[PDB]
Design a protein around this ligand. Sequence first.
Ligand SMILES: [Co+2]
Ligand SMILES: [Co+2]
Ligand SMILES: [Co+2]
Ligand SMILES: [Co+2]
Lengths: 324, 323
Amino acid sequence: EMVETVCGPVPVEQLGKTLIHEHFLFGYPGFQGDVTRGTFREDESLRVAVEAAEKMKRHGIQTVVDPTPNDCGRNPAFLRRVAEETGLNIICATGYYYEGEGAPPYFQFRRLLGTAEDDIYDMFMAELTEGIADTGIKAGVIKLASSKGRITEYEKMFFRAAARAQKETGAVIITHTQEGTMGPEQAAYLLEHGADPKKIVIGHMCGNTDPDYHRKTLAYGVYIAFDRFGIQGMVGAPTDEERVRTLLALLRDGYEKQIMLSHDTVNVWLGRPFTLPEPFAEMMKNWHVEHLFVNIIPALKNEGIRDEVLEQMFIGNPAALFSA
Amino acid sequence: EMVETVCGPVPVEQLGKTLIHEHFLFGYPGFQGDVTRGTFREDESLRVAVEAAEKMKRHGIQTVVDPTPNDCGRNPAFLRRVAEETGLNIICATGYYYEGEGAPPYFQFRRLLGTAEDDIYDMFMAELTEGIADTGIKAGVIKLASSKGRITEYEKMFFRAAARAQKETGAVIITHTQEGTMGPEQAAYLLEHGADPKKIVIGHMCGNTDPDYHRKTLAYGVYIAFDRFGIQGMVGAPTDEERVRTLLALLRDGYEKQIMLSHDTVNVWLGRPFTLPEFAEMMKNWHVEHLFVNIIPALKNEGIRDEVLEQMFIGNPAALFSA
Ligand SMILES: [Co+2]
Ligand SMILES: [Co+2]
Ligand SMILES: [Co+2]
Ligand SMILES: [Co+2]
């Protein structure tokens, strides 16, 4: 009845209103090489991350799951500073990103050595049950990710190791799907290797606008996340209007106990700062941690979605997910 | 008359006997994510790196070029510690690894933003002329790398940015070729964009065993490096026997003023320790003493004169780093 947060064990019944997928920090693999022009400025980054946490608190959020992959700049000690300052519960992940935008050379080399899959399992177990580096922080979820239209041989090593670690620990699995593909396949593959559907969240499901695709995924008994609200135009993403359309169809079908919502924000980008071209910039203007509460939830309520359904998604579902 | 080292500017005439391509530290992109089990043990790592430096010094080496890419664990401050302890000159690089085993997602994303090539040029300029991060250390070479049988669109951004930076600074370019491919192509592409051949070293040329391939590359007036002595069986590499045969053919043709030798050692691996299966026997000579204990004696057995050896290890690095 406990879950590991960046501040240690917290009762699952105390998690309350939760955002299932947000990043305080994130960097695309390779950001480390641009350190000269893209140095991590700790004080300012903490100020920004604390501000994001305070914005979430204003809307009643008590818990955030931050599934930043190990190869994408994950910094549990930094998350702990945010949580210590704000009182927000933050749950972090153990896992690597998908092959296309991850850093596969390292575990590809170890695959050639014959140890990669066992090494990954060993990493998962260490980070779930002992601690991440010298931080003393345990991950509360395993992060998995697949490529567009396939789960690659590289990715499958992590999927199998995740299923094994889940069987041993009861840990929650959170996933990334790329461009609205592989939802059913991820669920099928994980269950095939003994993972518990009630402990799995198939992510970025809002990337697909065909409700039959979602129904196919939901039939495995897993949770799904519409976790990219505010992301429009980029990353192959549909519009928020399309996201809302798909979500309403599923809620009207009675799937509320399997659905969670988030933004997948990046509050501090690692590496060099940037600005989106006016094309994407305007389309992306709502990509921030208050968007669900200021814009999306009101749009849902304008479409007849009741408070009890909303509370199921934000409070009931995370509580069930993290409970044995 | 100066070159930037990890300890600051040093007269080129003082570089002396040089190894053109060795790594004190190296990690494959992704090693950072395995920090829990693959901790960087700095004290032991420094001890190992210093030991390697002392072995080099015993054979008269005064200077090492360490071209560890920015995305492969480059650590200029660590290199400075090695240099401070040993008195060795160490020259580091600015650059990214090839697309296949580097970390392309970052600059691929900036390419979608439309600024990537300009950002890379800016990075090169910053690290050559200002300093790397907050270390105060400037890079002395630009490192470029290409894939097997292809200089990819991603890689070409770095090639073009490097030529632009070279024109502005006169900086040396050191390259990686993958599996004995793209030597002529790298030289041709760099020269197309105005790079100076007398400031270019095409690396891993020992990866190809056809001397005609080397001659095609040498025709551009660039340097070539037989820089993987001791690597056998792995990374698609030929045998040292084949490397020596190829080298002797080129020395016979009188190409010594364009050739440099090295091992491409990785003295400390970043991430988790590993062992090669037995493969390990084939790789047993991959260490910083191999050129001096094994390869050079074999060349001398074949009648290669001291002045030719000195040209490769002393004359060539001096000419390369001189205006
Ligand atoms: Co994702
Ligand atoms: Co995400
Ligand atoms: Co190389
Ligand atoms: Co190298």
